[PDB]
Design a binder for this molecule. Structure first.
Ligand SMILES: *[C@@H]1O[C@H](CO)[C@@H](O[C@@H]2O[C@H](CO)[C@@H](O[C@@H]3O[C@H](CO)[C@@H](O)[C@H](O)[C@@H]3O)[C@H](O)[C@H]2NC(C)=O)[C@H](O)[C@H]1NC(C)=O
Ligand SMILES: *[C@@H]1O[C@H](CO)[C@@H](O[C@@H]2O[C@H](CO)[C@@H](O[C@@H]3O[C@H](CO)[C@@H](O)[C@H](O)[C@@H]3O)[C@H](O)[C@H]2NC(C)=O)[C@H](O)[C@H]1NC(C)=O
Ligand SMILES: *[C@@H]1O[C@H](CO)[C@@H](O[C@@H]2O[C@H](CO)[C@@H](O[C@@H]3O[C@H](CO)[C@@H](O)[C@H](O)[C@@H]3O)[C@H](O)[C@H]2NC(C)=O)[C@H](O)[C@H]1NC(C)=O
Ligand SMILES: *[C@@H]1O[C@H](CO)[C@@H](O[C@@H]2O[C@H](CO)[C@@H](O[C@@H]3O[C@H](CO)[C@@H](O)[C@H](O)[C@@H]3O)[C@H](O)[C@H]2NC(C)=O)[C@H](O)[C@H]1NC(C)=O
Ligand SMILES: *[C@@H]1O[C@H](CO)[C@@H](O[C@@H]2O[C@H](CO)[C@@H](O[C@@H]3O[C@H](CO)[C@@H](O)[C@H](O)[C@@H]3O)[C@H](O)[C@H]2NC(C)=O)[C@H](O)[C@H]1NC(C)=O
Ligand SMILES: CC[N+](CC)(CC(=O)Nc1c(C)cccc1C)Cc1ccccc1
Ligand SMILES: CC[N+](CC)(CC(=O)Nc1c(C)cccc1C)Cc1ccccc1
Ligand SMILES: CC[N+](CC)(CC(=O)Nc1c(C)cccc1C)Cc1ccccc1
Ligand SMILES: CC[N+](CC)(CC(=O)Nc1c(C)cccc1C)Cc1ccccc1
Ligand SMILES: CC[N+](CC)(CC(=O)Nc1c(C)cccc1C)Cc1ccccc1
Lengths: 315, 315, 315, 315, 315
């Protein structure tokens, strides 16, 4: 039941010989052990096509201050909240986001009688991702980032643990999210790794991108069965060809810009456009002076590519 | 009728033994009760398609400072405005917007003779929303967020109330907005839950989504009654099929992404496309030469989808 | 002809018993009168379709400091420039933009011998607008916001005047701008109201939005006078309908998010698409088993709508 | 060869009776003369269609501090670098960008033995521009802005000079950039006027726009020299009409907004559309059963517009 | 094995006669030598079409503080981490990004017993690039930036070295990146010149602009060898030519904005069009009153352009 006056007197006289610039140890030749417990709360996913996933994480850093220990016999307080600029706290940062991460300290530290210190932090940053889009829509992403100390190497401060959990609502929207994190020993200090794996789901909206690949397909075989007596055919074919190539342009603006392998949808569209153009050329050449063969080739190639797509299919 | 000199003296000598880092209580073993009165002022709606609603709220925090009580006998001032960095105030935040909420303190606190303190705050944040598009064009959105203390748990500071009102303009902008908020007890402290539910008002701007379905329904059913003597029947069937599939492609781009269940319009149109394609395939197979039974069943399937669509109709 | 040393001596000893947190009045029970002179400098109009106009205004606040009066007999200075953080100034803000307006105090206050103080401020904020699109593309907007004190109510500080002017270059670019501003008495203090009225010009570039409609009108009535012999008519028409319904979606994207009345362009496009669909159905049923009648109906409806548009026409 | 110790001693005792809030003059009734030397380094051009050109400029302000003069007899230092918050420097700003210019001071001031002070500044601001698109694609723009003291009027501080230069790599791509600079005298003190004139280059990619102008020209002339025996002439004329109007729309989507006058190419294509439609309706009348007059009118108008276009043609 | 108390005592008494505004030299008439070691970590190339590449670099500045030398005999500390606002550090900046680079000092400095000081910095800035489009899609970019001291010239501070390395993952993604950096001597002090060269990799996705040309080429050369007896030849030529105009319009939207040369592919296409259209004209006009000649010229010039492209062809 500590009253205001004694908490005031304590706060006046509990950092007497304390310098927040010095790691709180009785022997400074050894590292200070900091534990981390991380929770991935949300993902943005806006620029995931360009290779950047904007995620938010919550950290609970825990360490031991060996200079701010007291006992209730003299100060009947079991714990306190102390601002971040009054005592030593470690500065953490993640690779490739130093300049685009505001890092405003707003959560005070919580310090116990025996020196245990807990600090709350939240990071909102881009984690770069590598895209495997051979099967599209069902692209797969792998992401990685490393947390490190802003000022301390392995001989000055070390991550004693690194655990990650999830809010259970990461994978609720069009992603299978699987994470793993553990502490590594980097060249310039102790690092905490964080690896994410995102696998797109089978949403109807994502599969709508297949319909164009259907349309042209129909239109393609639909050049064959037309008024061959009329020259309209060649013109019609040309028209289709144009549309197809234009669509490919628009298509390239959606595909993950840089995949480990070329997506099969693009190859199918290229094949269809090439076949339509050659069909127009062939019909006009015949008019100057194959059907079943063209249909057989189309069927063979399309079935091979669809079989590959089924092979790479996920559920 | 306090003059400038006596208010100057009071301001000089009214925080003598006061530390703003300490909750203003005479017994600190119990939580400080903070009451909140909230008003949802505006909505953005821009990114509601992605699943984020950007709202602005005005908060009136009210608590009791037990160390700044005075009486008019010695200080003829009934109330004062004192800056946010002179006396203790609680820092509030909302889930999932810690790192994208500027939180600039610009309104001073108002303190009465007996310690009653009122503070004004304004938050402008993204409240994540979940979309149900079963009845699209009309969609339903549910949004939720929680307010919490940056620094205090249930044993150090508690929300004694949580009330919300509106500006009477949220309803006007093409949305039925209904909200409900109350104080909860979370795992890590007292929380203020705020829940929003947005339905979409009826607009004549949804003939854009009704007309195509009606016209395509009529065209599709009219394929049965044609100059069946003419082979053009299969031509009409194919052209209608392509038109339907192109419409599917266009439509799928204006449905919400994270839809809980597939919208009914999509099912109606995709089934109509299936029907027309089956009709064309049957016509061509007959020309070159179970189908009828399936078509008969299909019409019933469309009747089922249309009944579900009308059952979910709003006003 | 005051020298550096006497201005130095003055600046050292002219805020002796002054607290910038107190209103500079000899009797603090009465309000402090602050006069405002505003000027709308520029408009953005980028997001005006979404219902937000971004304007920049210049303010000249003028009040009387009843505690910093001096006379040239002792200090040969007629006036001074004193930084904003040395003497009391009122904090002003506007509705619905508290969280997205960066308060950078960069202009010093100008204080005369008799206490008159002038301060320069510049605000850059969104002002929400209500749209009327009954006549489109010649849409009309009404916008409105209020200025208020951050920290003072009617019994503490009051706007003694509120006057606005314009830079004369507001209406030079595709808008007729009319403004009006006066001081009101709000529930929570004195308010300064600012009302804008924007009316779009007749820019011939804007008129191209009517060009697509004309394309269809032609194609539409260009369905009857064709090689009807070729049942394909049905097909051409179905193409037309598809095109119209793919346009209408983009147009709905273009239209103002919400209008007090439904724009006529949308209704006309809906009618044209409907007529095209019925034309297809009619040719189909006729082939299973009007031209001049269809033309008369189209002419009547179009003339009625254009007559309503001309009735609503302004300038 | 001044050592560390004597520079330390100098820095300690060279602002003894110096207030940075007072203009450094021995007679403060007269203005302080500040000289400016500006260099336009880069332009952004991204929003130049909307009328905003984002430019970066480097300023070297020069003035004379009459209170920080010393001689090497007592302080063997010829010049020093002193931070911006130790001595008086003038605050400069530009019109219509006060709220969207960071204005971070990062370059120290260079002060010589006799008081001459040089300061570096870099502005990155939008400068509103007026577009003249009569000649398209060779559109031309004019921009202007003014620099002014944040805190001083003509009787307290004046610009003694205002010179400008370019970066020598400014007009090297797609623009003929010209500049002018002079010291005006407004109602709120001395002003520094900066005027820019941008003229688009003759990049052959832009000349691609002229290809359609000839195509649709060829097509209109071509309508007459065809198998007029076939009534299809109506169909072909309607086709060129529809294509021309569709183009007109697409091009209008490219023309700059708020243009001073309607571009010539727009009128050319409008008249070509009119000619095509007139020919189509004339052929329809012929089928129902002025030609040479229409051809003469069209040739005259098109040749007049082309002569004009080529008259303004640059290079 | 230094304990907390002696490090506290050291930090209290190791900046006794130190001014962080003074370069840490014993003879200040000579420059202070600062070494740099740079690493381009990532690049964004989102706006690379506009000519701006956004790269992130990591710097390790190294210099010698001649005033903070101590020895272990009195202070058993071999090195220390000291904040950036306790001792002198140089301010570095790069050309043309002063106003769009946050520059937050977050990494402390590491100082050794003998005065060697290291500092960590990270810059995230745009580096302007020049585009060569002669080989399309295999465009080549050249970029350059210059690092300099915010406050020091060649007689006050100098870059003793300037070395750059790479993270080895720059070129992993659709770019050949080759850097080079060395120190220069500019007119405003020592400079660090950084040069980049980007050359797009030869993918298959970047070979979908080959097919549209090739096919078109054939089509264009297939206008001559046709059933010339059939007058429809001219109609097919108009169809292909309209396709050509549409494809030219599409392609003009993909080229880099400001290329030094004229993209060869764009040339090929536009020239093929103009000459084929002239051939069709020639045919119709002559009938109103060459084929092989136009085919020969088209082949000659198209092959000349293709060879000109193959010349610079990369892999
Ligand atoms: C320093 O003091 C702190 C708190 O005074 C100690 O931490 C607390 O230690 C107790 C056990 O001594 C923990 O109790 C256990 O908590 C878990 C919750 O995960 C619960 O499941 C168990 O049934 C049990 O109640 C308590 O959680 C823990 N709290 C915190 C915040 O750490 C710490 O152990 C002391 N260290 C030393 C070296 O004395
Ligand atoms: C501490 O002092 C404050 C103000 O001096 C007290 O708050 C005020 O309490 C009075 C009643 O004592 C309230 O009067 C009532 O106001 C309501 C408005 O809802 C009105 O409908 C009633 O007819 C009556 O006039 C007054 O509103 C209220 N004002 C504020 C700003 O809180 C507070 O009760 C005092 N606390 C204690 C423990 O004495
Ligand atoms: C306190 O002192 C200030 C400045 O000495 C007084 O304001 C000034 O008052 C004079 C007249 O007393 C004004 O002169 C007039 O100015 C207008 C411009 O609007 C001009 O058109 C007239 O011909 C005449 O010259 C002067 O403008 C005005 N200046 C300012 C900045 O307010 C103020 O009246 C004094 N107040 C008291 C209570 O004595
Ligand atoms: C106060 O002292 C400063 C520097 O100590 C003087 O500025 C410098 O003045 C000298 C002449 O006294 C200038 O020398 C000339 O420089 C030009 C460069 O344009 C050169 O072409 C000539 O051959 C000659 O060397 C020097 O440039 C100039 N430097 C600067 C940075 O301004 C200033 O004149 C003194 N003022 C008074 C009132 O004594
Ligand atoms: C001032 O003290 C610092 C550190 O005490 C000295 O820097 C260090 O100097 C030693 C040699 O005296 C270097 O050792 C060598 O390091 C290289 C790594 O490149 C290694 O390959 C060699 O086998 C050898 O171990 C050490 O690297 C170096 N460290 C740093 C961070 O620079 C510095 O030389 C002293 N200055 C003077 C003037 O004595
Ligand atoms: C949900 C409360 N939340 C977010 C509002 C995060 C939090 O404690 N989750 C958490 C963590 C971080 C680790 C393990 C287990 C759990 C449940 C509080 C918070 C913590 C640090 C910084 C900011 C907020
Ligand atoms: C409209 C005035 N307004 C916004 C300009 C908000 C305000 O009082 N509404 C309100 C609240 C917040 C609670 C209950 C009842 C009402 C009417 C003032 C304000 C309050 C807090 C923070 C910022 C501004
Ligand atoms: C044009 C000079 N200008 C803008 C550059 C604005 C200014 O005085 N016009 C003004 C105002 C604000 C009210 C009434 C009458 C007039 C002429 C100076 C300025 C004023 C306040 C803040 C920033 C700049
Ligand atoms: C190129 C060096 N540069 C830009 C990196 C600008 C500079 O000296 N050009 C300059 C100026 C500003 C006026 C007249 C003549 C010249 C050559 C240095 C700089 C100057 C001021 C502010 C920031 C940087
Ligand atoms: C990978 C660690 N990293 C980035 C996390 C960069 C780093 O040491 N690479 C580096 C440099 C900068 C120069 C030479 C050799 C190497 C390996 C540390 C770092 C350095 C400066 C600023 C911030 C972080």
């Amino acid at each position: 039941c500590w009253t205001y006056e004694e908490e005031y007197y304590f706060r006046s006289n509990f950092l007497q010989q304390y310098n927040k610039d010095i790691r709180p140890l009785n022997d400074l030749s050894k590292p200070i052990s900091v534990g981390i417990h991380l929770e991935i709360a949300k993902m943005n996913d806006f620029n995931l096509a360009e290779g950047r996933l904007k995620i938010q994480t919550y950290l609970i850093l825990q360490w031991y201050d060996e200079k701010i220990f007291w006992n209730e016999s003299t100060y009947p307080i079991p714990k306190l909240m102390v601002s971040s600029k009054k005592i030593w706290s470690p500065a953490i940062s993640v690779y490739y986001t130093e300049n685009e991460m505001d890092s405003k300290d707003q959560f005070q530290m919580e310090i116990y009688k025996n020196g245990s210190v807990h600090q709350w932090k939240s990071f909102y940053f881009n984690i770069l991702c590598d895209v495997n889009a051979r099967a599209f829509p069902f692209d797969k992403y792998t992401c990685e980032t490393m947390f490190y100390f802003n000022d301390y190497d392995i001989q000055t401060a070390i991550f004693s643990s690194f655990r990650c959990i999830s809010s259970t609502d990461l994978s609720r929207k069009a992603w299978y999210v699987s994470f793993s994190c553990d502490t590594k020993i980097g060249e310039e200090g102790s690092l905490g790794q964080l690896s994410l794996k995102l696998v797109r789901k089978v949403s109807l909206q994502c599969l709508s991108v297949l319909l164009p690949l259907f349309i042209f397909f129909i239109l393609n075989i639909m050049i064959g069965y037309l008024p061959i007596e009329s020259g309209e055919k060649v013109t019609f074919a040309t028209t289709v060809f144009l549309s197809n190539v234009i669509y490919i342009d628009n298509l390239s603006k959606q595909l993950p810009k840089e995949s480990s392998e070329i997506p099969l949808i693009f190859l199918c569209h290229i094949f269809l456009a090439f076949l339509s153009g050659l069909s127009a050329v062939g019909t006009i050449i015949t008019s100057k002076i194959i059907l079943y063969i063209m249909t057989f080739i189309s069927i063979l190639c399309a079935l091979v590519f669809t079989s590959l797509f089924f092979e790479s299919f996920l559920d």
